[PDB]
């Protein structure tokens, strides 16, 4: 007999009640193949969370462009937008593609992400990379900061929890990338600094976690995805996305962590 998904679902719905919006969750145990799925195929805005996949797409390009990663990008003030703490620091020198990638992933640097998007042929270039690995859901249409608008009903700049998790698995654990590039992606995710109150908060401290967050700043819209390695066990991949109907509904990191805990504990 199969899982009673109504029972697996119940506590996510209770969390939604107090939150005042929608929570989307997909979690996959790579050992057993067990999953937890709550609104997993609904669309949610990516916000900054596209930056993980951006870095993967950059790594993919580097496979065909030797020394791309150590190439300096030297930019002018037009590259700069708010929430770009690392790229702002290096305006007077420039940053290598690798540095930009790490900044986009680990500090969620906006300008760094726009610079790398330009390298890939814009939002459509990143979407094309995601199509190349079989992700038909992911869509990045706009740049920083407009991609964060998170307007209800807008499908631009969204994906699903399930597609995010599936794509993350392919890129971090599967062989979609060459092994050095795969390990570089994993290391960048592992060194994220912005995720300590989201999925990481649900995970025992001594288990390795790599994640990427997003916070649109409106419509209760915020998220995190991660790969989790429990010691001596097969890794877990999961995604937790929120949105809410009013512009002024607050996002909640606590809700994200609680949804992550519920997902992780429901596996098997
Ligand atoms: Cl400029």
UniProtKB/Swiss-Prot annotation:
UniProt EC number: 3.5.2.6
GO molecular function: beta-lactamase activity
An example Gene Ontology biological process: response to antibiotic
Catalytic activity field: a beta-lactam + H2O = a substituted beta-amino acid
Regulation: Not inhibited by EDTA, inhibited by clavulanic acid and tazobactam. Inhibited by cyclic boronates, including vaborbactam and bicyclic analogs of taniborbactam.
The keyword Signal is assigned to this record: yes
Binding site for a beta-lactam: 48, 51, 83, 108, 110, 213, 215
UniProt entry tagged with the keyword Signal: yes
Listed InterPro entries: Beta-lactam/transpept-like, Beta-lactam_cat, Beta-lactam_class-A
Highest taxon of the lineage: Bacteria
Keywords recorded for this protein, A-Z: Antibiotic resistance, Hydrolase, Plasmid, Signal
Residues annotated as the enzyme's active site: 48 (nucleophile), 146 (proton acceptor)
Stored Pfam families: Beta-lactamase2
Function: Class A beta-lactamase which confers resistance to the beta-lactam antibiotics, including penicillins, cephalosporins and carbapenems. Acts via hydrolysis of the beta-lactam ring. Has penicillin-, cephalosporin- and carbapenem-hydrolyzing activities.
Family according to the record: Belongs to the class-A beta-lactamase family.
Miscellaneous information on this protein: Initially two different KPC beta-lactamases were identified from two different Klebsiella (KPC-1 and KPC-2); they were later shown to be identical.
Protein's name in the database: Carbapenem-hydrolyzing beta-lactamase KPC-2
